[PDB]
């Protein structure tokens, strides 16, 4: 079929346009966006500090396995302040930071899959979270969830002998018994004051001062999670699941390296 791509729009065909053929359509629903993101993927491993169950919380990380996590598919952490509250970043940090270093496994915390494939500028969804302890023995976990933009310094212990995470009317979740399945599951609502969230980049600053640092739009996450527990030696994986995902404005995905090899790829 002759065409004119300059218009910015190109008529779609099937083999039927130029040759003696037939259309070969067959229905499927796995390509709907909602269905595609409605599955769990991991964002990293976390840890609890010793005796956090009965004392003041304090930022801390085990092996670049911190204490709290921001609910977002984007990068966060910054292995250089593994002992500071984590923050959202605008780049992913490799495993090492010098030539001889390695890219995997990554040091920052993110939904690498989401990052690798999110062809949209903005999205909206609810977040389903799964906490999975890397142990099949008893495990106690206390979780505090704070909506985005609310107080996130659960530092003052107000009650003698009670974790400072376990304070107030802010949602707290706790699993700990000899008959539990150890894992924790729950879904949080959408709390950004924003109408829709930037999926990759947000071309603006944080203050009107233009104290220039573009990338992330403020309060564009699902909140922060703080952990306290009893097995300070067991790490747990945190997984995200996008419930009723909606995306707006297609945009490009992550670059894939030219096979300076064949005329095809594979796996790994």
């Amino acid at each position: 079929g002759v065409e004119n791509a300059e218009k910015g729009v190109t008529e779609n065909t099937d083999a039927t346009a130029d040759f003696v053929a037939q259309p070969v359509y067959l229905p499927e629903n796995q390509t709907k966006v909602a269905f595609f993101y409605d599955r769990s993927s991991p964002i990293g491993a976390f840890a609890v500090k010793s005796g956090s169950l009965e004392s003041g919380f304090a930022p801390f990380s085990n092996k670049a396995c911190p204490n709290s996590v921001i609910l977002t598919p984007g990068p966060q952490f910054d292995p250089a302040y593994d002992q500071l509250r984590p923050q959202r970043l605008t780049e992913i940090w490799g495993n090492g930071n010098e030539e001889t270093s390695e890219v995997f496994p990554l040091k920052t915390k993110q939904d690498y899959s989401f990052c690798l494939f999110s062809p949209f500028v903005y999205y909206k969804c609810d977040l389903e979270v799964t906490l999975s302890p890397h142990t099949s023995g008893a495990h106690g976990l206390l979780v505090r969830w704070c909506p985005t933009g609310t107080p996130t310094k659960p530092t003052t212990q107000v009650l003698h002998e009670v974790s400072s995470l376990s304070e107030g009317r802010t949602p707290q979740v706790y699993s700990a018994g000899p008959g539990t399945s150890n894992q924790i599951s729950f879904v949080v609502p959408y709390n950004s004051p924003l109408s829709v969230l930037p999926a990759v980049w947000y071309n603006g600053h944080k203050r009107f001062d233009n104290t220039g640092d573009l990338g992330i739009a403020p309060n564009s996450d699902f909140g922060t999670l703080f952990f306290a527990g009893t097995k300070p030696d067991i790490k747990f994986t945190v997984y995200l699941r996008y419930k009723n995902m909606r995306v707006f404005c297609p945009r490009p995905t992550v670059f894939f390296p030219w096979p300076t090899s064949g005329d095809k790829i594979d796996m790994t």
């Binding site: 269905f35 409605d38 609502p189 419930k243 009723n244 995902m245």
Partner: protein, 58 residues
């Protein structure tokens, strides 16, 4: 469409709880309801008409 959920049973938690509540704002604004409940302090005797009146200055 929908996602990946295919349970026959009616969701045990109702929607306003299972999901966020999509609201829609109209361009031209919306009027608050008139009253938020029935709590109120009341001002009485505000005005007039009736007393030991019109002996009262003009």
């Amino acid at each position: 469409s929908e996602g990946n959920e295919g349970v026959i049973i009616n969701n045990f938690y109702s929607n306003q709880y299972q999901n966020s509540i999509d609201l829609s704002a109209n361009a031209t604004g919306s009027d608050p309801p008139k009253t938020y409940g029935q709590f109120s302090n009341l001002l009485s005797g505000a005005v007039n008409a009736f007393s030991n009146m019109l002996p009262l200055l003009a």
